[PDB]
Design a protein around this ligand. Structure first.
Ligand SMILES: COc1ncc(-n2nc(C)c3cc(C(=O)NS(C)(=O)=O)ccc32)cc1Cl
Ligand SMILES: [Zn+2]
Ligand SMILES: [Zn+2]
Length: 323
C-alpha cells in the first residue's frame, strides 16, 4: 500500500512525453513511480488495457508486484533492466514497426514476458546455480534453470489476488498467451539463443523466412526477446557505458562467490582482478552475440536499424579502448 494509491491516482503521461518510443531511451533520470507510469503507458498504447478488459487498479498492482519481486541490490538484473527490456520491446513494436506483424496475444505475451523475464534473479548465472547445488537446478534438470524460475515467478504474480491482469481472457486466449509467455521467458537464456539462432539466420540467408509459419513465428519471438534483453549494448555510449559497469559489478560479485564457495579462480568475465579485459570482451561479445542478431532483426524490419546502428557505434568505442 501507499505506492499503489500514488500510482493508481496518477494521470499517465503520453508516450510522446515519456520518450518511450525512442530506441535511445534512458531510465536513469526516472523515479520508480515514473517507470511504473511508463509501463502503464506501454500497455495502454499497445491496445492491451481495453482489448483485454484490464482494470486500472489491477494493472497498477501487478506492475508494482513485478517491480517488488526484483532484487534491488543485484547490480544489473533488477527492476531497471526488466523495465528497459520492456521499453525496448515497446520501441521495437512501435518505431521498429514490428507491431503489425504480430497478433494481439503475441504482443500481450511479449510485454508481460519482457517485464517478468528476470523475476527474482539472484545475480549469479545458471552455471553457478548448478555448481552450488541449487535446488532450482535439481528441479529443472540443469536446463535454463534461472529462466524456469523467472517463469514460475511470473505465474505466481499473474495468479496473485488483485494482480490478475489476464483474468479477462477467454479460456483459449489464456492458454495461447501463457504458452507464448513461457517460450518468451525461456528464450532469454543466452544458451538457447546460441542453440537456435543458426536456424533463424539460415532461414533469412536462404530467403526461406516466413512469419506466417507458426514455428518460424515462435523462433522470431525468441530472437526478438534476446534483442530486447541485450539492448543496453545498442544505447548511446554514455548510457551503454553506465550499464556495462552494472553488468561488470554483477559478474565480479559472482566471481567473488566462486572464489569463496567453489575455491576456483573465476574466468576473466567474472574476475575483478582482470577488469582490464573488459573492452576486449565487450568487442568479442558484440561480434559473437550481438551484431548478427541486430542485422537479422533489421532484415525483418528495416525500422529496427537504430538498434544495429547503436551496436556498431559501441563496438567502435570499445575497440578504441581495447587497442
Ligand atoms: C552494456 O550492455 C551489455 N554489456 C555486456 C553484456 N554481456 N552479457 C553477457 C552474458 C556477456 C558476456 C561477455 C563475454 O565476454 N563472455 S565470454 C566471451 O564468455 O567472456 C561480454 C559481455 C556480456 C550484455 C549487455 Cl546488454
Ligand atoms: Zn535472464
Ligand atoms: Zn534479462
Amino acid at each position: 500500500t501507499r505506492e499503489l494509491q500514488s500510482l493508481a491516482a496518477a494521470v499517465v503521461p503520453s508516450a510522446q512525453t515519456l520518450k518511450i518510443t525512442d530506441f535511445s531511451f534512458s531510465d536513469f533520470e526516472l523515479s520508480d513511480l515514473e517507470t511504473a507510469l511508463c509501463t502503464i503507458r506501454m500497455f495502454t498504447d499497445l491496445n492491451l488495457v481495453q482489448n483485454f478488459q484490464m482494470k486500472h487498479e489491477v494493472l497498477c498492482r501487478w506492475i508494482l508486484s513485478v517491480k517488488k519481486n526484483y532484487r534491488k541490490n543485484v547490480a544489473y538484473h533488477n527492476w531497471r533492466h526488466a523495465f528497459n527490456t520492456a521499453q525496448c520491446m515497446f520501441a521495437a513494436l512501435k518505431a521498429g514497426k514490428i507491431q503489425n506483424k504480430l497478433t494481439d496475444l503475441e504482443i500481450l505475451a511479449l510485454l508481460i514476458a519482457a517485464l517478468s523475464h528476470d523475476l527474482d534473479h539472484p545475480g549469479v548465472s545458471n552455471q553457478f546455480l548448478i555448481n552450488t547445488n541449487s535446488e532450482l537446478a535439481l528441479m529443472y534438470n540443469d536446463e535454463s534453470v534461472l529462466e524456469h524460475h523467472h517463469f514460475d515467478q511470473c505465474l505466481m504474480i499473474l495468479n496473485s489476488p488483485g494482480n490478475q491482469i489476464l483474468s479477462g481472457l477467454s479460456i483459449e486466449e489464456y492458454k495461447t498467451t501463457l504458452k507464448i509467455i513461457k517460450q518468451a521467458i525461456l528464450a532469454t537464456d543466452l544458451a538457447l539463443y546460441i542453440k537456435r539462432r543458426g536456424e533463424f539466420f539460415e532461414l533469412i540467408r536462404k530467403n526461406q523466412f516466413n512469419l506466417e509459419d507458426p514455428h518460424e513465428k515462435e523462433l522470431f519471438l525468441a530472437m526478438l526477446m534476446t534483442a530486447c534483453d541485450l539492448s543496453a549494448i545498442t544505447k548511446p555510449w554514455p548510457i551503454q557505458q553506465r550499464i556495462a559497469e552494472l553488468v561488470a559489478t554483477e559478474f565480479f560479485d559472482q566471481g567473488d562467490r566462486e572464489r569463496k564457495e567453489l575455491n576456483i579462480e573465476p574466468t576473466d568475465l567474472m574476475n575483478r582482478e582482470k577488469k582490464n579485459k573488459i573492452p576486449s570482451m565487450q568487442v568479442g561479445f558484440i561480434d559473437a552475440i550481438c551484431l548478427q542478431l541486430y542485422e537479422a532483426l533489421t532484415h525483418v524490419s528495416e525500422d529496427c536499424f537504430p538498434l544495429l546502428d547503436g551496436c556498431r557505434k559501441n563496438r567502435q568505442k570499445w575497440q578504441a579502448l581495447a587497442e
